[PDB]
Ligand binder design. Structure first.
Ligand SMILES: C[S@@+](CC[C@H](N)C(=O)[O-])C[C@H]1O[C@@H](n2cnc3c(N)ncnc32)[C@H](O)[C@@H]1O
Ligand SMILES: C[S@@+](CC[C@H](N)C(=O)[O-])C[C@H]1O[C@@H](n2cnc3c(N)ncnc32)[C@H](O)[C@@H]1O
Lengths: 282, 282
């Protein structure tokens, strides 16, 4: 199955009128990406990124694991006033699920015995492998999980498994990039992004665009000054206009009735505008 | 040229965590509609509507006219923390424009002479017709506007003119509907909405949908409980499911990775998902 990654600059957070709205905006990004089953979000420095990245990670992390993975931070002061992702890997105890994220507990194992994992279930989940504690893992529960002395049983599996195997969106990862050229180069896939797509009012009409067969797509968004800012700023990138950095450069809202479309708005519009092209090619 | 109207319930404002966010959410709606060149927004009562309607009107009104048309209200306490529409009819003095909205001043006219209008220009604009003051009008400036004794000159024209004639998006109007059946029936066009479109995760796939040639489109959105709530609530509408109220009932985001898409999010997604179908048929 193909991947989709989204890049945008942290600087959009500097545009907010309030601390509260700065947080809400971060949430808007998370949900936009969750909605379109994004696998990866890349926060890049166009000239804050740390705050945006942190918030995105907090929201993606299932709830029963936030306490463990995120100590009190001034950068999640407004956790509260968030929109939740309501994504398949966020459930309550109650819900039976095939798979469930977990943290490798830090309790006494016994010579030979796999670790304990906290999957937010009524009891801890016992597994096969002995593992380094505080590791986030993806556990697939057994079956024949008898009313066993205060332990469920299961096996750890690839975090790719709930997509490839059961068609379940299962969260995104978050990557920090120090510039726009680091967006492309510090990619997590062997052969980079088979397909790159940039966005702008002065790009080509998205209705013309013909998506090439692809394996890993990246869609890039600018902040307030467009992608021009992050192109110029980066020393490793000497272009007249940013169109040439990407396979495609699209305008996703023809005949827009506002002089501007904000980044968080543009992401929803662009990803829908593209969603059918994406599905066809991957 | 075809029209596009959007309907949604005021109740989405009751979902906000803050007074501030209640206002911001209202703004999100305005911009979504501005972006897609919406002509009409219909706020309906699914079981607040007044507050949402007011905010939408405040944002659409050009700035130089807000003071005149909107006294201090507790329902625009957070005007400040808004996103602006940046639409063609919002400019500063500075900008030369062919057309410009105005209010008919309330100054001494002379037997025979047209009114004075305030179009936010350096001088008042003198016109042809004698008109009832406090009327919002659409003025088209002349040419041969000589350095005349502290008055510009121009003619009042249809508010439809800057679209039909110069391809300029020029704002939306706002209508209150007391229920869902009032959305369709209290429509401002002789022959209603030639095409109706409702939205839901349990609608048909938007990629299949084949838009009929049309003159006036309405796209309807539910609040938190979907359109089911406003269907049931209204006494004049006895249906098992809301699909049948509309010509088309679409899911605009196939394979969504969040269990829910909020109304303000769904509007951006749906309107993009449809925008190309719309353009083809009108
Ligand atoms: C506030 S806009 C940037 C405006 C800036 N003045 C410029 O010249 O692009 C923020 C980002 O949203 C996206 N965007 C805005 N309008 C768009 C459009 N019509 N089509 C596609 N993407 C758009 C782009 O990624 C853009 O960099
Ligand atoms: C929070 S959702 C409503 C959820 C509600 N539980 C239901 O059963 O619809 C608010 C509105 O956004 C729109 N919406 C949400 N998901 C959608 C989807 N997948 N496709 C199209 N419109 C959608 C619909 O107008 C919906 O009534």
């Amino acid at each position: 199955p193909y991947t989709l990654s989204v890049a945008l600059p942290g600087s959009i957070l500097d545009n907010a009128q309030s601390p509260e709205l700065r947080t809400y905006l971060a949430g808007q990004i998370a949900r936009a990406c969750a909605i379109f089953c994004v696998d990866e979000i890349v926060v890049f420095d166009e000239e804050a990124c740390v705050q945006l990245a942190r918030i995105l990670q907090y929201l993606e992390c299932p709830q029963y694991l936030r306490k463990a993975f995120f100590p009190k931070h001034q950068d999640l002061q407004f956790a509260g006033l968030l929109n939740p992702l309501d994504s398949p890997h966020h459930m309550r105890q109650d819900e039976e699920s095939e798979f469930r994220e977990g943290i490798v507990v830090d309790r006494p194992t016994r010579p030979g015995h796999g670790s304990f994992v906290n999957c937010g279930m009524k009891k801890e989940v016992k597994i096969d492998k002995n593992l380094e504690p505080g590791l986030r893992v993806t556990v697939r529960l057994n079956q024949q999980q008898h009313p066993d002395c205060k332990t469920y049983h299961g096996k750890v599996v690839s975090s790719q498994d709930p997509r490839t195997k059961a068609g379940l969106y299962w969260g995104y990862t978050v990557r920090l990039a120090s510039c726009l050229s680091a967006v492309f180069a510090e990619a997590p896939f062997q052969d980079g992004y088979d397909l790159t797509i940039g966005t702008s009012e002065r790009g080509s009409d998205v209705a013309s665009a013909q998506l090439p067969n692809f394996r890993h797509a990246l869609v890039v968004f600018g902040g307030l000054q467009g992608l021009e800012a992050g192109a110029d700023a980066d020393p490793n990138l000497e272009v007249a206009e940013p169109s040439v950095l990407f396979d495609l450069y699209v305008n996703t809202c023809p005949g827009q009735g506002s002089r501007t479309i904000r980044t968080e708005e543009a992401i929803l519009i662009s990803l829908a505008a593209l969603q059918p092209g994406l599905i066809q090619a991957g």
